[PDB]
Amino acid sequence: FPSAVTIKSWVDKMQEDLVTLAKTASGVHQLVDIYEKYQDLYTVEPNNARQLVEIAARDIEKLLSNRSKALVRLALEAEKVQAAHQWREDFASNEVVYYNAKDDEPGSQRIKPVFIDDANFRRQVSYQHAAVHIPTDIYEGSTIVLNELNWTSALDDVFKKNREEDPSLLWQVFGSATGLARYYPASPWVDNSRTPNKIDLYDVRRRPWYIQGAASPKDMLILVDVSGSVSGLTLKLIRTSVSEMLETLSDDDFVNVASFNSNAQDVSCFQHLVQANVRNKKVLKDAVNNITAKGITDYKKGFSFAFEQLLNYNVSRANCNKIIMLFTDGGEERAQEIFAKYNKDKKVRVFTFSVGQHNYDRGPIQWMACENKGYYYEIPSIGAIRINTQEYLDVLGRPMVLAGDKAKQVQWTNVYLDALELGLVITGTLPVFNITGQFENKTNLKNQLILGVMGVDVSLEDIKRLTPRFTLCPNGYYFAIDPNGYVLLHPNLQPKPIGVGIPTINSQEPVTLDFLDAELENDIKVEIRNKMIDGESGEKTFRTLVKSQDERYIDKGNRTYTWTPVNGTDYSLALVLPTYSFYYIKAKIEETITQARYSETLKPDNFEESGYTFLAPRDYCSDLKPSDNNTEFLLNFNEFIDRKTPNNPSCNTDLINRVLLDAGFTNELVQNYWSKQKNIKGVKARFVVTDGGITRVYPKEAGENWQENPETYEDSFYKRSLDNDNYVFTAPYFNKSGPGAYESGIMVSKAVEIYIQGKLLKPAVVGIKIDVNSWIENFTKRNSDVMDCVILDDGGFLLMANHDDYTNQIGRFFGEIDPSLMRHLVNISVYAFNKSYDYQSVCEPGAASKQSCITEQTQYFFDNDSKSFSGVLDCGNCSRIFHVEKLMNTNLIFIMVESKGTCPCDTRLLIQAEQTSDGPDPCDMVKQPRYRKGPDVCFDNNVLEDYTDCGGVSG
Ligand SMILES: *[C@@H]1O[C@H](CO)[C@@H](O)[C@H](O)[C@H]1NC(C)=O
Ligand SMILES: *[C@@H]1O[C@H](CO)[C@@H](O)[C@H](O)[C@H]1NC(C)=O
Ligand SMILES: NCC1(CC(=O)O)CCCCC1
Numbered sequence: 027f028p029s030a031v032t033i034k035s036w037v038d039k040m041q042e043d044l045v046t047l048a049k050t051a052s053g054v055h056q057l058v059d060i061y062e063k064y065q066d067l068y069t070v071e072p073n074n075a076r077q078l079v080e081i082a083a084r085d086i087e088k089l090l091s092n093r094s095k096a097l098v099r100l101a102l103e104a105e106k107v108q109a110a111h112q113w114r115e116d117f118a119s120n121e122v123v124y125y126n127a128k129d130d131e132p133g134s135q136r137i138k139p140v141f142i143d144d145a146n147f148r149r150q151v152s153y154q155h156a157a158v159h160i161p162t163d164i165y166e167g168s169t170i171v172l173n174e175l176n177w178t179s180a181l182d183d184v185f186k187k188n189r190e191e192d193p194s195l196l197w198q199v200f201g202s203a204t205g206l207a208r209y210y211p212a213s214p215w216v217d218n219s220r221t222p223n224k225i226d227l228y229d230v231r232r233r234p235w236y237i238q239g240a241a242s243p244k245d246m247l248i249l250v251d252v253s254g255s256v257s258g259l260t261l262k263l264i265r266t267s268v269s270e271m272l273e274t275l276s277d278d279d280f281v282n283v284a285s286f287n288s289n290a291q292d293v294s295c296f297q298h299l300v301q302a303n304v305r306n307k308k309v310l311k312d313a314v315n316n317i318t319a320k321g322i323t324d325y326k327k328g329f330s331f332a333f334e335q336l337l338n339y340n341v342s343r344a345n346c347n348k349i350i351m352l353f354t355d356g357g358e359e360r361a362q363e364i365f366a367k368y369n370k371d372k373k374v375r376v377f378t379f380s381v382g383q384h385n386y387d388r389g390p391i392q393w394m395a396c397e398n399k400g401y402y403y404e405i406p407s408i409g410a411i412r413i414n415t416q417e418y419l420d421v422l423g424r425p426m427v428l429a430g431d432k433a434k435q436v437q438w439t440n441v442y443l444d445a446l447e448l449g450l451v452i453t454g455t456l457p458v459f460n461i462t463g464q465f466e467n468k469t470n471l472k473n474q475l476i477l478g479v480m481g482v483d484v485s486l487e488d489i490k491r492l493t494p495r496f497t498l499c500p501n502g503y504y505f506a507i508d509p510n511g512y513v514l515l516h517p518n519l520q521p522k523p524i525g526v527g528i529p530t531i532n533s534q535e536p537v538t539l540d541f542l543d544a545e546l547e548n549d550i551k552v553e554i555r556n557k558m559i560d561g562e563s564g565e566k567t568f569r570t571l572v573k574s575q576d577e578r579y580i581d582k583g584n585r586t587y588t589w590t591p592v593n594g595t596d597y598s599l600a601l602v603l604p605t606y607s608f609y610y611i612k613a614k615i616e617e618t619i620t621q622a623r624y625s626e627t628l629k630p631d632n633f634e635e636s637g638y639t640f641l642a643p644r645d646y647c648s649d650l651k652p653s654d655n656n657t658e659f660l661l662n663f664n665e666f667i668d669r670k671t672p673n674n675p676s677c678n679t680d681l682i683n684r685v686l687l688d689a690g691f692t693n694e695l696v697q698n699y700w701s702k703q704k705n706i707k708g709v710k711a712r713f714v715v716t717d718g719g720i721t722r723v724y725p726k727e728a729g730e731n732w733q734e735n736p737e738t739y740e741d742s743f744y745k746r747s748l749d750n751d752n753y754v755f756t757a758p759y760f761n762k763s764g765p766g767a768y769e770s771g772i773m774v775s776k777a778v779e780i781y782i783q784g785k786l787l788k789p790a791v792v793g794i795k796i797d798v799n800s801w802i803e804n805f806t807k808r809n810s811d812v813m814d815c816v817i818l819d820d821g822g823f824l825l826m827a828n829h830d831d832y833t834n835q836i837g838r839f840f841g842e843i844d845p846s847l848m849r850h851l852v853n854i855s856v857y858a859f860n861k862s863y864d865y866q867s868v869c870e871p872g873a874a875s876k877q878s879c880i881t882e883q884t885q886y887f888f889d890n891d892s893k894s895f896s897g898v899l900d901c902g903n904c905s906r907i908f909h910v911e912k913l914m915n916t917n918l919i920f921i922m923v924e925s926k927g928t929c930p931c932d933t934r935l936l937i938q939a940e941q942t943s944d945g946p947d948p949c950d951m952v953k954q955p956r957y958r959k960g961p962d963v964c965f966d967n968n969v970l971e972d973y974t975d976c977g978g979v980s981g
């Protein structure tokens with residue numbers, strides 16, 4: 027084995043050759059000189075984080091206030107119209123005229139719309155009437171529905187006025203308590219190719235934006251009868267009913283499921299109330315779908331357990347509605363002592379359900395439902411499950427109605443996918459009360475229930491339009507959260523459902539992504555989250571690990587967080603801004619000739635002498651649309667520049683001027699430096715990616731192999747080389763599909779830095795692609811049999827070797843071609859690994875299309891800053907020798923080891939690719955939960971409530 031001095035000399039020579047080639051071919055110094063030469067076509071402007079955060083929060087507050095005004099006006103008009111309405115049953119003679127969706131009878135006339143095409147809504151809509159959706163099980167000929175249409179036909183004028191006030195208005199909707207939902211503008215309902223599995227089961231009374239406004243958060247505890255007398259069809263009905271009941275809960279509600287058969291016990295691992303999010307609800311459903319019926323019944327022990335679990339106060343709760351929902355069939359036990367012991371003051375409601383078809387006594391069940399301020403329900407078949415499990419929100423809404431005026435508060439819901447194919451939206455909510463005979467105080471019996479719920483939608487793209495990012499760098503961004511910790515805005519939130527567990531095969535759920543799951547978790551992150559949840563203002567500068575856009579690299583970077591609360595609402599907004607992005611360049615190019623030249627630069631027929639130009643698809647104009655092809659997008663851009671005046675009445679001037687300035691600088695670089703040395707031996711392509719959104723590859727034929735995102739803010743190598751302070755080598759993918767490795771080369775990148783007035787700016791990155799053949803020629807200058815020589819980057823991705831068998835698989839993770847060496851050096855502190863979870867992932871349904879899944883990812887990086895390593899790879903029965911050695915000014919390492927053949931010891935390979943996992947364990951996250959702050963306004967237990975109408979004594 028050669029000594030360490032010769033190894034150091036070899037590594038020094040290789041580093042010198044590689045770094046010299048990259049530096050001379052790229053042109054970092056030339057680009058920096060070109061940037062600094064003018065200093066008169068642009069101006070440096072600061073990015074004051076606090077002012078930007080305050081302005082964005084103010085804009086968001088103003089938008090939400092506008093939506094709240096619209097909701098209040100709609101609710102007032104609806105209440106006033108419903109108050110003065112005459113009941114009638116003569117709909118045969120006089121008909122109600124309305125347009126119905128999901129179509130194509132006496133008393134109803136239908137309307138044929140025009141359905142023009144609109145750009146905001148991604149479908150065809152009409153602005154002359156409001157569509158009406160009536161669920162399948164609701165017959166549109168009944169007198170209740172006819173009266174509903176008759177008195178709701180007055181909302182169209184206020185809808186039109188609302189849309190005239192703010193043309194950017196999205197869907198407006200009134201969901202009635204009778205089942206029908208009237209929305210504006212008119213548009214046909216949804217259908218998917220009329221497949222047999224495309225039945226419309228939509229019911230507005232079950233939508234979360236309706237439930238969150240129909241009542242207040244609760245502390246439900248589902249008590250399930252699992253005695254022997256319930257086995258059969260009724261047990262299956264009970265399981266389905268419990269699942270449907272759990273489907274009505276949200277994040278603000280807390281729930282647990284218990285069972286009793288001569289003994290009361292929990293149904294799962296929780297043992298107490300849990301926040302009832304997607305994971306906990308999935309656990310509860312899976313636990314309740316595995317219960318068996320046996321033993322005698324004992325209501326006293328079960329109710330004692332249910333009351334005991336509601337008096338904990340040692341855990342996180344809601345303290346707003348303690349309700350016990352019993353699911354049973356029948357019995358003869360009333361258990362007066364338990365109710366007189368645990369609630370003399372009727373502080374806990376008891377709802378009772380009799381499930382199945384049987385001949386058991388239902389008297390004591392109704393007595394339990396009527397004594398406590400509860401209700402009694404019957405579920406004899408699967409058909410009644412949908413309706414007879416969402417009716418408890420009428421009982422829970424009586425105190426809110428009795429409170430009345432002080433309960434008219436606009437609430438905003440979670441982020442969810444619109445059912446009419448609009449993306450990610452949030453819905454405002456305001457209930458409407460029934461005030462007929464209010465000035466005479468006559469009935470006050472049917473006035474304890476709400477007419478319905480009104481809603482208005484705001485798209486997340488409207489939120490993103492209020493937080494511009496192109497004055498920042500590719501590493502700075504906004505993000506906002508709600509007091510539950512979930513994310514309202516983030517670059518890592520995608521229009522996909524949240525995955526739960528491993529998908530096993532034989533828009534209903536919300537998109538709830540926590541802040542600590544959209545990024546890498548850290549103690550400072552936890553402190554910042556807890557501090558901004560409580561509506562504080564702060565700023566914190568620290569150092570943290572950042573994952574690359576392509577989930578294979580992790581780099582250490584300095585970050586700064588600045589968070590303020592959004593006034594009026596309950597959201598908090600932050601702004602992550604790296605230290606080198608406190609200043610930006612604005613273009614002061616106000617002159618015809620220079621702009622004309624910089625625009626002529628982009629002509630597609632100049633690519634011979636200007637490289638293969640790309641262009642980021644940005645909103646440069648209102649009339650310009652991102653074409654997603656970039657071959658005609660640049661043509662449209664050139665046409666607009668050629669014909670439209672540079673005044674830009676409807677277009678940003680800053681973005682256009684920035685693009686022109688970057689085009690001029692990049693063309694100067696290409697024409698003055700790259701074009702001189704046309705052919706370089708080891709270089710296959712020379713590229714440059716700028717901040718304004720222009721990327722260039724000099725050999726026009728090399729552009730066809732440039733498979734990079736035209737949006738320079740989405741290029742992983744751009745961000746990676748901005749974070750690092752040296753040359754960055756990017757490893758090609760293993761095989762995928764398409765040219766690579768030998769065809770393309772190896773990408774080396776370096777960011778340019780300028781000090782124009784003592785201020786650090788990084789406005790571009792450049793680099794080259796290296797031919798594999800010449801690199802191998804200079805590496806051997808072997809296919810040996812007793813010595814292995816490999817080169818890896820920070821990440822363990824093989825870039826070159828000497829066996830000519832490793833070099834065929836270039837870019838593959840080194841832990842799959844030589845497991846023992848990688849495992850050994852992963853604990854010599856030369857490599858460190860981070861494991862994280864991704865929830866918005868799709869996996870092939872395994873051997874239990876695609877389904878949502880959770881994928882665990884692992885990334886590797888250099889742990890200890892030591893330039894040399896040594897030791898012996900004693901695997902047992904042999905002893906290999908290795909001299910791992912890093913390279914300077916580069917993220918590469920050089921390894922020389924004994925051949926694998928000499929040691930028969932074979933170990934298991936370790937994989938860096940994502941693994942379809944099922945964790946983390948939910949039974950542990952509830953013992954030490956995160957920090958949350960629930961709502962304070964709670965409406966319950968009003969003494970004027972009648973509650974004389976239970977479900978038993980009336981029949
Ligand atoms: C709210 O509405 C008013 C009137 O249309 C408008 O001036 C204001 O700009 C709107 N809010 C925002 C954030 O645009
Ligand atoms: C509002 O209350 C009155 C009086 O009890 C009742 O007749 C009417 O049906 C209620 N409104 C609706 C839409 O049910
Ligand atoms: N946002 C509410 C919708 C879909 C939903 O209920 O999620 C129904 C009414 C009209 C707009 C769409």
Ligand SMILES: [Ca+2]
Nearest residue numbers: 253255256323
């Ligand atoms: Ca029983």
Ligand code: NA
Nearest residue numbers: 438439440508
């Ligand atoms: Na909320």
